[PDB]
Design a binder for this molecule. Structure first.
Ligand SMILES: Cc1cc2nc3c(=O)[nH]c(=O)nc-3n(C[C@H](O)[C@H](O)[C@H](O)COP(=O)(O)OP(=O)(O)OC[C@H]3O[C@@H](n4cnc5c(N)ncnc54)[C@H](O)[C@@H]3O)c2cc1C
Ligand SMILES: O=c1[nH]c(=O)c2[nH]c(=O)[nH]c2[nH]1
Ligand code: FES
Ligand code: FES
Ligand SMILES: [Ca+2]
Lengths: 1289, 48, 49, 49
């Protein structure tokens, strides 16, 4: 019966029955109704749930503020703290400056990450009202944004820091910050700071939580109940509970205990209580490093180096050092450092105390330590380094498995004094075994040796043998990990050389070759530089005509404020139920039986739905080959078998765990190769063929052949799939609120499942927190299940997927395997090309076929090839069905082209840019599919980019860097693109709108398009305002609905502004026609008088509008007809610098020139260029999905699937929209923008490839010249291609 | 599949209406309804 | 809709007078399809202003 | 006839939904000289007047 008492936005909360399993995010959203704070992952990686905590810190005596992940904070940890959410700082009637700046600077597109970013920046300013650029960037290590490409967020917020074209925004118009106007710290909390803390107890449905006030209490509890689970930050325990199914019925939180939180400076080092957060560790060691002799702080710096790329501020502010130590993960970045430096751990239980020195025995087995079940960790002394003692720490980047196979290391040497000879040597590693280990057999052998080439070589042979990995070892990447242990020791070896240098023993150890110096540098940032250029509108254009002006996204202010409503923010009806999907754990099997007996015992359980419950048809999906619910047989891991319905989401999840399912495996077809071998394909070969191949290859001076594999991609929309379905009880009527790009298909699929006509079913979309193709079809898998539940129960029902579920079920971009043969002259001119394409389609057809067609339509990229043959086959496999992803086959096709193109240039020994340029089409040419290229701006984009990037001069610097550096290399590449605009299915090129003018003059518009962050509604309002000649302020769009505009195409193919814009324009022209007679009578009198005059003359003020793209329709049989209405063009030049020893790399600079025609909105269009480019960047360099050999997706969250971060973007990032290029066939002479820029990120891929080529000439010996680089080019693949003494043996 | 719109608005205004009290002219109504009813009752003279 | 079903709405509200019933009868004559294929769900200012 | 038809109050409440009650004049024509809300504030679940 202890009450939990805390504050939220200044208001007192008194929770009488707090449940220990309740997170702050759940409490905010579901109990208090404050939905600005979002769920994007549930595991601390995305930061969408970031909120600020304030409290009176009794140990430092004063009010402190820090950020936290609400998704991982147990509310039971929050007694007597003050929470601040996005809503507690400001709202649309008085925006905080942080909210104002991110909105106005075009830092919010879909808006779903905006609150959490706002909170990270807001917390930074409460702690440092005048930060640096550097501090600003570090604020967001724990925040992900999938839309923006991050540039505008940092640029807007830079305005708080450093303490031809118009501009995208005006900082001078930003209101200044006044800190006195921040919320008061709750005075009640200052009152209570005085009274002593009492032990509390909270009892939940399954878990008991004791908040221990005293060491005595904690020790007594653990003596008597050794099973009591310590929780401090919950940043590990939360994950185990939420995602690993684990349940600790008794938990003790010791966070309040003074002795667990102390910092004491002693003669050997600094002792930290075990509950000290990593953020306190960081601030103390930083200041020690600033004030002490370098010779003493070698270990401290190794710890700091590890904390750098670790997690965000949010995690570090509550994650304890003791928690990392005791979690004992094989990939702890800290334990290798503590082990290598022999850090001093004190352990206690009731009446016992002992000190040990972390060494290999501290960790005896997988996730185990030396602690007895009744002992806790009191402190760790992190040691000063001695004279002659040196330390480095290292960390693989890239992470693929939950627990294993990322290399991380701590390395230490002590020299006999005045010598170069070794007294002590310790080399400790994670990610090489099932625990943190010491190279215990290798190090003894170097004792009393001198630090020299012999010792280097000796330690590398030892390491290779002692840490050797079986070909099948857990986690794979065995060749890379081996190479890293050796490469990391090399760096340490070189670094110690240097450090002996600085101690004046250069003559005994030798100088470092100056071409080796860059090998040992710690990662250095370099300040960001950005330029955005676009075109001013005509001087005569009215100020009320916003077409072509950088008008901010109409919802940006509400998105910054947390007031924008996404699906799960909609309040629950009192009778609403929750649904949870139950999916197959096998790739191909018979369902032999289902047992729900354990499920029925969960409180609130309502029913388990299966195929037998479907009223009408179980056949769904775009090509009618999918089940709503599995029937007899599962065909991927993730195949939806049924759905639990229960009163709450927690009860649905627990009940789904009690659906026990019984299988008999069947032969599974997983990989593209499996499918080829089994003849398992969707339909027949697709083919495009032109000219005479036999002749072209006969005429070719050279022929090159090869293959390329391209990995898939998860959309990672920050808002996962979600549907609320609300049954109306009459006539089969139901309304659904859905995060979907496809209202029409959602409506149709629901109606067919239920067996009711389409006229009964309304689908509503206000907005999505991203879609990117992922929600073009695959959102219906959740929608139909929920609609069924609602129909069955007569009650509203809701489902929002957890990130792991969404990543498993909904599929992604199609992996591609290509087999190519290219024939070319000595000049680089290509005369012949044959490419076979294969895609992995997963277990349903979905859009796979149209994706292949687009890839074939783009196999030319920018290049005229007189004799050409492309084929594709779409593989049918036992994996989740892959679907649309921004690009839709184009990027895969064009990467293959640029890949064989890279080889044509190297084979000719000619500069790649010359070779590309001379193969480029010209105006009037026909594509391989016989479409003529008119208004071909690509050469203009090319020349502007070459010039403004100073490509030639940078080439010369890259060559020089590479001649002067042995262990880092630069690469530079410029890539073009041509991208066809219109759906590959002709009749999908149509759109409609509906417009009303009310008698006050205000206009309500809607159209078929859905807002997913791309600024579609903004554009449509811009269009309507110009069409009507009234300000944007009089025009509003509230939502998209099947009952206002029917039969709509999905929001896809980059086409939606073109199509809906024309629909809107026509709707508006109808209204203007009818107001004409009133305009003539009253040519000056305002708009409101014309409207009211028309009303009172009984003239209709409502109209529909419609457009169809004319003259489209390509034939594959006759290779004629236009599949596209026009083409987009762009060019990017990118520069990289790779670490030849590690595989890591920096994106130094990118310059993009993009043809968006006469942009409707250059702010939104630049944002789409940057957004798309950055998704491409992830596709080609970082994003890697990984599966068991039996077809189970392992990579299910941001801990293992790594999308671009704030720190990933090109350091200098320039974007220009091409000037003077109206495209008069689309709306007000614009072009679509969403998809074409994505492929331009291949520039980074090819630049990495140049850099590898240089590394190979440096250390290779006999190196294969046309070496292999599959996509994505991750640190593994880059490192393994940098052949050297370390990769060879 | 031929990309023809399958949504339409419709509208109607009753024509030729408008009476003036000042000139006793103009039609207020589009047309008139007509009917007739015959009813029989029996009252209680003592109770109402 | 593409299944041939018709969703209709108009300015009038149903208060027991059978307006919707009459409107569907009217639409079904006009369109020359059965009344079963035509539905009216509601009256709303954002469908007819 | 089945009670399936939904009239306004049949619509389920949202979990966060509130209720309103009008307060009206007990006089045909009068000045309002004061309003005292002190007793109303003591009723559990009172939000605002
Ligand atoms: C987004 C994210 C990114 C991360 N990145 C990294 C990274 O890059 N590198 C890295 O090494 N780690 C990383 N971690 C792990 C993180 O450092 C640990 O989760 C954290 O330090 C655990 O501390 P905690 O206080 O949250 O522990 P809790 O989860 O509360 O406790 C974890 C374990 O420690 C035990 N425990 C805690 N204190 C004591 C004590 N005094 N005595 C005995 N047992 C105790 C608990 O019983 C439990 O078994 C990351 C975690 C997240 C969520
Ligand atoms: O031609 C396309 N058709 C689509 O259905 C689609 N979806 C998408 O994201 N891009 C494209 N392109
Ligand atoms: S939802 Fe909390 S970090 Fe992603
Ligand atoms: S605007 Fe950041 S995730 Fe969409
Ligand atoms: Ca598919």
């Amino acid at each position: 019966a202890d009450e939990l008492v805390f504050f939220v936005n200044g208001k007192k909360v008194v929770e009488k029955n707090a449940d220990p399993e309740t997170t702050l995010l759940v409490y905010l959203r579901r109990k208090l109704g404050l939905c600005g704070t979002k769920l994007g992952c549930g595991e601390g990686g995305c930061g969408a749930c970031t909120v600020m905590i304030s409290k009176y810190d009794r140990l430092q005596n004063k009010i402190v503020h820090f950020s936290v992940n609400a998704c991982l904070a147990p509310i039971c940890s929050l007694h007597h703290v003050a929470v601040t959410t996005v809503e507690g700082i400001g709202n649309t009637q008085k925006l905080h400056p942080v909210q104002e700046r991110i909105a106005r600077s075009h830092g919010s597109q879909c808006g779903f990450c905006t609150p959490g970013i706002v909170m990270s920046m807001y917390t930074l300013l409460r702690n440092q009202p005048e930060p640096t650029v550097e501090e600003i960037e570090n604020a967001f290590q724990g925040n992900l944004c999938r839309c923006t490409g991050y540039r505008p967020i940092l640029q807007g917020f830079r305005t708080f820091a450093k303490d031809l074209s118009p501009s995208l925004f005006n900082p001078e118009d930003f209101k200044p910050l006044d800190p006195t106007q921040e919320p008061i710290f709750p005075p009640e909390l200052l009152r209570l700071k005085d009274t002593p803390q009492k032990k509390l107890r909270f009892e939940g449905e399954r878990v008991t939580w004791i908040q221990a006030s005293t060491m005595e209490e904690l020790l007594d509890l653990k003596a008597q109940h050794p099973d009591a689970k310590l929780v401090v930050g919950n940043t590990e325990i939360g994950i185990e509970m939420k995602f690993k199914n684990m349940l600790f019925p008794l938990i003790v939180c010791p966070a309040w205990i003074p002795e667990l939180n102390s910092v004491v400076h002693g003669p050997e080092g600094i002792s930290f209580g075990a509950s000290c957060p990593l953020s306190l560790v960081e601030s103390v060691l930083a200041e020690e490093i600033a004030k002490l002799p370098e010779q003493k702080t070698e270990v401290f710096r190794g710890v700091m180096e590890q904390l750098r790329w670790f997690a965000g501020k949010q995690v570090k502010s509550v994650a304890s050092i003791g928690g990392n130590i005791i979690t004992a993960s094989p990939i702890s970045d800290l334990n290798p450092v503590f082990m290598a430096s022999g850090a001093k751990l004190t352990l206690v239980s009731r009446g016992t105390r002992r000190t040990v020195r972390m060494d290999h025995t501290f960790f005896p087995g997988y996730r185990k330590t030396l602690l007895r079940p009744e002992e806790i960790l009191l402190s760790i002394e992190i040691p000063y380094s001695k004279e002659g003692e040196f330390f480095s720490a290292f960390k693989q980047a890239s992470r693929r498995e939950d627990d294993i196979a990322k290399v991380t290391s701590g390395m230490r040497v002590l020299f006999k004094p005045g010598t170069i000879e070794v007294q002590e040597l310790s080399l400790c590693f994670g990610g090489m075994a099932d625990r943190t280990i010491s190279a215990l057999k290798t190090t003894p052998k170097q004792l009393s040796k001198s630090w020299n080439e012999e010792l280097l070589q000796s330690v590398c042979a030892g390491l290779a043998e002692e840490l050797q990995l079986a070909p099948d070892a857990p986690g794979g990447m065995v060749e890379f990990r081996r190479t890293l242990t050796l490469s990391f020791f090399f760096k340490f070896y070189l670094t110690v050389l240097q450090k002996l240098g600085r101690a004046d023993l250069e003559d005994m150890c030798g100088k470092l070759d100056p071409t080796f110096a860059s090998a040992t540098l710690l990662f250095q940032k370099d300040p960001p530089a950005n330029v955005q250029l676009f075109q001013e509108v005509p001087k005569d254009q009215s100020e009320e005509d916003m077409v072509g002006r950088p008008l901010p996204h109409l919802a940006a202010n509400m998105q910054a404020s947390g007031e924008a409503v996404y699906c799960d923010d909609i309040p629950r009806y009192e009778n609403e139920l929750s649904l949870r999907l139950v999916t197959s754990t096998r790739a191909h099997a018979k369902i032999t039986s289902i047992d729900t007996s354990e499920a029925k015992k969960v409180p609130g359980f309502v029913c388990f739905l299966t195929a037998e419950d479907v009223p009408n048809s179980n056949a769904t999906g775009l090509f009618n080959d999918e089940t709503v619910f599995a029937k007899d047989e599962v065909t991927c891991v993730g195949h939806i078998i049924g759905a639990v319905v229960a009163d709450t989401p927690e009860h649905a999840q627990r009940a789904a765990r009690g659906v026990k399912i019984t299988y008999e495996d069947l032969p599974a077809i997983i990989t593209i190769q499996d499918a080829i071998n089994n003849n398992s394909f969707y339909g027949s070969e697709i083919k495009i063929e032109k000219g005479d191949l036999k002749k072209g290859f006969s005429e070719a001076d050279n022929v090159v052949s090869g293959e390329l594999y391209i990995g898939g991609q998860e959309h990672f929309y920050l808002e996962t799939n979600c549907t609320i379905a609300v049954p109306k009880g009459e006539a089969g009527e139901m309304e659904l609120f859905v995060s979907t790009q496809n209202t029409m298909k959602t409506q149709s699929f629901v109606a067919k499942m239920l067996g009711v006509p389409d006229n009964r079913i309304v689908v509503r979309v206000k907005r999505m927190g991203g879609g990117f193709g992922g929600k073009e079809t695959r959102s219906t898998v959740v929608s139909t299940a929920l609609a069924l539940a609602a129909h069955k129960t007569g009650r509203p029902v809701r489902c929002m997927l957890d990130r792991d579920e969404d990543m498993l079920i909904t599929g992604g971009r199609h992996p591609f395997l290509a087999k190519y043969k290219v024939g070319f002259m000595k000049t680089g001119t290509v005369v012949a090309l044959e490419v076979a394409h294969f895609s992995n389609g997963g277990n349903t057809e979905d859009l796979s076929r149209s994706i292949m067609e687009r890839a074939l339509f783009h196999m030319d990229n920018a290049y005229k090839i007189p004799n050409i043959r492309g084929t594709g086959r779409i593989c049918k496999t036992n994996l989740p069905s892959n679907t649309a992803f921004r690009g839709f086959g184009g990027p895969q096709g064009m990467l293959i082209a640029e890949y064989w193109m890279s080889e044509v240039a190297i084979t000719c020994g000619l500069p790649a840019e010359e070779v590309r340029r001379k193969n480029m089409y010209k105006e009037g040419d026909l594509t391989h599919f016989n479409q003529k290229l008119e208004g071909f701006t690509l050469p203009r984009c090319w020349d502007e980019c070459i010039a403004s990037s100073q490509y030639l001069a940078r080439k010369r610097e890259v060559e020089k860097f590479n001649r002067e550096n042995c262990w880092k290399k630069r690469g530079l590449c410029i890539i073009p693109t041509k991208f066809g605009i219109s759906f590959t299915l002709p009749f999908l090129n149509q759109g409609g709108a509906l417009v009303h003018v009310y008698t006050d003059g205000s206009v309500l518009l809607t159209h078929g398009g859905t807002e997913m962050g791309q600024g579609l509604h903004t554009k449509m309002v811009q269009v309507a305002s110009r069409a009507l000649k009234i300000p944007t302020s009089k025009i509003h769009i509230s939502e998209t609905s099947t009952n206002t505009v029917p039969n709509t195409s999905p929001t896809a193919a980059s086409a939606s502004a073109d199509l809906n814009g024309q629909g809107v324009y026509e709707a508006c022209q109808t209204i203007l026609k009818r107001l004409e007679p009133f305009k003539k009578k009253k040519p000056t009198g305002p708009w409101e008088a014309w409207v009211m005059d028309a009303y009172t003359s009984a003239v209709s003020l409502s109209a529909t509008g419609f457009y169809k793209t004319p003259n489209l329709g390509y034939s594959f049989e006759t290779n004629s007809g236009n599949p596209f209405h026009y083409f987009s063009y762009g060019v990017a030049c990118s520069e990289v610098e790779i670490d030849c020893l590690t595989g890591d790399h920096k994106n130094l600079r990118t310059d993009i020139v993009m043809d968006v025609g006469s942009s409707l909105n250059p702010a939104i269009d630049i944002g789409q260029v940057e957004g798309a480019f950055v998704q491409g960047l992830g596709l080609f360099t970082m994003e890697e999905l990984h599966y068991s050999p039996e077809g189970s997706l392992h990579t299910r969250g941001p801990s293992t699937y790594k999308i671009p971060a704030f720190g990933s973007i090109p350091i200098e990032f320039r974007v220009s929209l091409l000037r003077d290029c109206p495209n008069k066939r689309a709306i007000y002479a614009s072009k679509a923008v969403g998809e074409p820029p994505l492929f331009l990120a291949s520039s980074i891929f090819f630049a990495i490839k140049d850099a590898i080529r240089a590394a190979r000439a440096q250390h290779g010996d006999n190196a294969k010249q046309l070496f292999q680089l599959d996509s994505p080019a991750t640190p593994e693949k880059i490192r393994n291609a940098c052949v050297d003494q370390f990769t060879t043996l």
